[PDB]
Amino acid sequence: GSIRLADLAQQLDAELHGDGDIVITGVASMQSAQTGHITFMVNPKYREHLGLCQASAVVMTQDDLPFAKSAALVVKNPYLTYARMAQILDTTPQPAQNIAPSAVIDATAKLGNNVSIGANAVIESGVELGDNVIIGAGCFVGKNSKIGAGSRLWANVTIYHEIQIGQNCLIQSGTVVGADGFGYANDRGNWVKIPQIGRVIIGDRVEIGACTTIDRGALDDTIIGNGVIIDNQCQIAHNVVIGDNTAVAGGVIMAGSLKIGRYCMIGGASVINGHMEICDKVTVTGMGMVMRPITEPGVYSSGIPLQPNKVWRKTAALVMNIDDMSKRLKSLERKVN
Amino acid sequence: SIRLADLAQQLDAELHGDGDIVITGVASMQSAQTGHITFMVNPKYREHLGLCQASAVVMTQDDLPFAKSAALVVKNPYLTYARMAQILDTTPQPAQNIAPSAVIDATAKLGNNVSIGANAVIESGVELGDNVIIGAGCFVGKNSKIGAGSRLWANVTIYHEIQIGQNCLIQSGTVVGADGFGYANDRGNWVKIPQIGRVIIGDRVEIGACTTIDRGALDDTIIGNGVIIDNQCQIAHNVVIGDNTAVAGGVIMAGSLKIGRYCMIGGASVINGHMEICDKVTVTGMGMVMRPITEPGVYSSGIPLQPNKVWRKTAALVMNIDDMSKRLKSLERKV
């Protein structure tokens, strides 16, 4: 929705320098910005390049101001301001509007005010959708699950039974919340399935990317804290607990009964062992092989990165044979001494 | 809900205490209340069993001296738990009856007690066995057959010409029978190889969520009886998995791999193709399986996590390990 520059500036707590009556219609990158767009500068090396930007307005800092070649919005944090102004000017549609005639909604489902449910979505008995909830097309929401006000599911999301989701969450398409995890007794090499009768409890302001899977707990619950952000194609196993505000990047695999503390950052493609704890304020860099509990905050890493294939072949062969290298070292140490 | 004594009879357990206790469900030791049965396997819990408020605790004979409530003594408490949980199971069905919004081709063949959920789509020629349940929003492609007692949760996709045995369970988001990744190459341009093989899934197979199993190129991808496959797995075209093998989450398998019976593939492993893994192999998590495995046992790979400052030195030294090896050889020569 178009907005006057002065009004946008006010909503952003920004100091306006230039024509408050400029009409901003959208956000754009510095190189793509055209007339009507607002953009932002986080890197002062672009100062000399601002005359090449066709935006009607640029978010920058007080130190950048003398360099502006446009109306400027002066803020302390241009990046945070960009996030805020992109929200105000967001062109992202809603996943649905009103209740589609093709949705199948059980008579016992309780719908709050202003709930939208897209075409061919399916809502089971006992489901409760709070005010302003939006369910995209093709979704499934299982028996007695509860979705708090303002939460939104994109198309083709699957929520199983007895799932609790908080307020102002967002779940991208293909994601599955509350499947049965691995739970088997071995009876003479034959697997005996254990019903998984715990739940998933997802807090408020949680964002979950696409094709992520979160299993329900075996007896007690899988728990996602408030403010957690989870990227695409993560596996969150039964009885995992993720503390508030933790970030999990794409493709992370967690085993059952892992507990992750608050404000952690789990880099993409990491692989995390179960029945153990990672404390608050831990960062695992990408592809981390987390076999053991982490009990101190800080940054942890693993992995031997890419080499030219000819080089890699020697590296891998020497590492695989490193015990023999170590013995040779020990015996050269004795021979010298 | 079941009387304790009736339950202990079905479980072949030696009851120690009031058999008239009504059991309504299973619960963890920490959570159990009046009405719940629970179990223990770790002797660590013995000291505080008086803090457990379950009506009954499944345990072994060596536990009974510590019991502080009715007990069911058994040899395998964990297997007894699986069984009593099946008896007391509360999980709903993916669907009940045939939804009027389901779309079912006229040539589909359905058995007794088939349920089909809302907006599911069943293609021409499909055959669904007795007691088969198809969750909401599923797609079942042309001529596919699903054996008796099998169940698909919501939003499962089964392609055409797929065969699934009896008493299988497939969780949401999973795709069975997509094209294998087969291409010829014509001067740098990829040329699709149509994948006209199938997937054959045995009896009693459990598959997780957002898993993909590709159809074979000409002959079939084969999943043996009793196999269990977790979430986020990729099973490429013409893979063969032997009976009772278990594959954990996020495992990625390349084409024409053969896995034996009774294997255990740890999460996030990567198994290369055109090779064979024999029976009774365990691969631990993140295993980089490059070569055939011909002997049973446990196999592992990977250099595990360290503090980042330490990792930087570890990885730099490893990357330069050839120089280290040459300097060791030079030193031996000089000495």
């Binding site: 059952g256 | 278990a246 740890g266 999460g267 996030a268 492993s269 631990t284 998590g285 993140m286 592992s300």
Partner: peptide
């Protein structure tokens, strides 16, 4: 064991 039940 690592990533196993």
């Amino acid at each position: 064991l690592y990533m196993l039940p």
